[PDB]
Symmetry: C3
Amino acid sequence: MSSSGTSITCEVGLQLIVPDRAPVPLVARLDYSVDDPYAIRAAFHVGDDEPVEWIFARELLTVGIIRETGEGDVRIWPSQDGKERMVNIALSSPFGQARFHAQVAPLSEFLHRTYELVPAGQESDYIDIDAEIAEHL
Amino acid sequence: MSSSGTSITCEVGLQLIPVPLVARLDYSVDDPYAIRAAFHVPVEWIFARELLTVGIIRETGEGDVRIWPSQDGERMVNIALSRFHAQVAPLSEFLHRTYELVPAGQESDYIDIDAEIAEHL
Amino acid sequence: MSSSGTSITCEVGLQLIRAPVPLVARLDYSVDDPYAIRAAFHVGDEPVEWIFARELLTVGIIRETGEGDVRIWPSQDERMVNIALSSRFHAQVAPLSEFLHRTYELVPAGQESDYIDIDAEIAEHL
């Protein structure tokens, strides 16, 4: 039963794949907080850029490494690069989907660490604590 | 507010960021993950109960909804569908009542009952 | 405990509610994505796939509910279910209900966690 404050962060190498253009490398900051136990925040930025932050369900990324899935405008699916296992994340927009491309190992490792803090199915405990703090604040 | 054992409803003072307005929140065990809010200037928003519980403590969001806390010296909650401003005390009390009917993590039982009803129509 | 590959599919008659236009939708559920249901259909316009929470459909057959853009609610005609994404489908409950029952037989409501744990475990060994 981890402390109410616990949180983890890492950085992951990514590529922005654009239809009629070459790939653009970029680093994404992933983080997970036990106070928001169903979520993963991801801050993407290109080169010397201030980030834009996406927030989505942790389970969507766990499932998306294994099979094509999605929620609303987010869409995640796996892929191969010969032997190398990849995961693809896309934001849907009428103005054309943009697409991220990353290797599985680092995302998997990060997710494994999040599950060590809060195992799948025990998120409730942390929701209860959040509710309890609010009920005294 | 008022509780029936099956459904709960309350009214909460809000501001559209300022213009004051009253919102009607309600929760029903037959939709155990959801909270419905109804505004006036009527329009109904429906979102995950957990999103509001988490949003009182820290910035979070789902799709177009974004919820985050703030200070007025008084603890506030901000909801912003792609900007509402309200006191935490009333929302917290309402959420506590919903958790008394259906504790976090036991929503499944009520989903099972909804499925059981449907299998016979 | 069903195996990691288990999946079910069915076809369901639908109407897009102008004049009503009949169309067939392909629903499928996979234990690897235990909270989700996929919906795929076409008119004429190449196919399009929607993905939503299983529980949203189970709840929507009983009462008005929604998540983000999706909105599901029941109605009378024969018992009907109405689904309405934004940027209106009309179907009988019997077939959806039977399909949802089959999905709960594979993965009961509340045991999705086990299948998430397997998905994590596979990734961890890739």
